[PDB]
Design a protein around this ligand. Structure first.
Ligand SMILES: COC(=O)CCC(=O)OC
Ligand SMILES: COC(=O)CCC(=O)OC
Ligand code: NA
Length: 290
């Protein structure tokens, strides 16, 4: 009945994502406009409906379906990408890096336990809702690739009936891939450069050759100022073998997360090239998805 046009005014582009105005309040929101002939966003909407009330998951405000497009209205992120803000802070410290990773990983731990893998958890999908710089303002966004574990009969399941074994191991693989991207995030927060790519021009083959070799530098340079506890966690999040990589639950038990209050609060020594990083990250995830 009531359409999206009726309660909202559409504004500039930000699937297609636009800014909009709720007419009764003049508050502003984001709407993701989804072409039903391209893809079925039932999964994405079910996940946002069930789980968007989490303080650190993007919150769903309104949904409409006109038969062509689905309109998914959410809070509008006004604080930009997390990594963009953090890489431009000269005085950022491991203690702040740990508070950020804690907030994010606690959210991922909750999702995985509810049977949800994100599958697109790159840094540019992790944003700040406002400019406060507070970890509470973090939001994980874009669940367009996420998946709920289900049984054969359609019944929502949690990893703790009958689910096909290859649905389970694939879910396991997907959850590990989620943690690996949080590893990429951590590495980059600590040093100002990404682990597998130097810039947007790195070839996909060389990025994948680095990923597949399971090796990345944890010593020297920007890493001289960084604690062993941090390096240890990074190494266990980026481990190339998903069977050996930490889970979200184990990340939260690492002393770098638990003992944050013993972490150095002096400034990290980092590359300052946030725009280079952005292109290196895009190159890294392009190589991955192919
Ligand atoms: C309402 O959803 C959007 O505005 C799409 C963009 C996005 O979520 O990027 C992280
Ligand atoms: C299929 O993609 C993934 O498994 C992402 C994580 C990963 O590449 O670890 C090496
Ligand atoms: Na939320």
């Amino acid at each position: 009945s009531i359409q999206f046009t009726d309660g909202y005014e559409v504004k500039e582009d930000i699937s297609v994502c636009k800014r909009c105005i709720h007419k009764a309040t003049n508050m502003e929101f984001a709407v993701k406009i989804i072409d039903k002939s391209k893809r079925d966003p039932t999964e994405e909407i079910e996940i946002l409906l069930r789980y968007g009330q989490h303080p650190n998951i993007i919150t769903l405000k309104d949904v409409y379906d006109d038969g062509k497009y689905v309109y998914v209205v959410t809070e509008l992120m006004k604080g930009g990408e997390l990594l963009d803000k953090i890489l431009r802070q000269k005085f950022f410290s491991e203690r702040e890096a740990s508070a950020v990773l804690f907030t994010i990983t606690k959210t991922v731990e909750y999702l995985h336990a509810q049977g949800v893998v994100h599958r697109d958890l790159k840094p540019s999908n992790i944003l700040y809702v406002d400019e406060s710089g507070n970890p509470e303002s973090i939001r994980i966004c874009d669940f367009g690739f996420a998946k709920q574990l289900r049984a054969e009969n359609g019944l929502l399941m949690t990893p703790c009936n009958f689910v096909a074994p290859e649905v389970l191991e694939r879910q396991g693989y997907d959850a590990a891939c989620d943690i690996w991207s949080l590893g990429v995030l951590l590495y980059t927060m600590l040093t100002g450069y990404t682990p597998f790519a130097n810039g947007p021009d790195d070839t996909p083959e060389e990025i994948l050759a680095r990923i597949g070799s399971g090796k990345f530098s944890l010593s020297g340079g920007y890493w001289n100022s960084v604690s062993d506890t941090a390096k240890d966690l990074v190494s266990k999040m980026l481990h190339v073998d998903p069977h050996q990589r930490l889970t979200a639950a184990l990340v939260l038990r690492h002393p770098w997360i638990v003992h944050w209050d013993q972490l150095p609060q002096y400034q990290l020594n980092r590359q300052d090239a946030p725009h280079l990083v952005k292109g290196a990250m895009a190159a890294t995830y392009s190589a991955l998805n192919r």
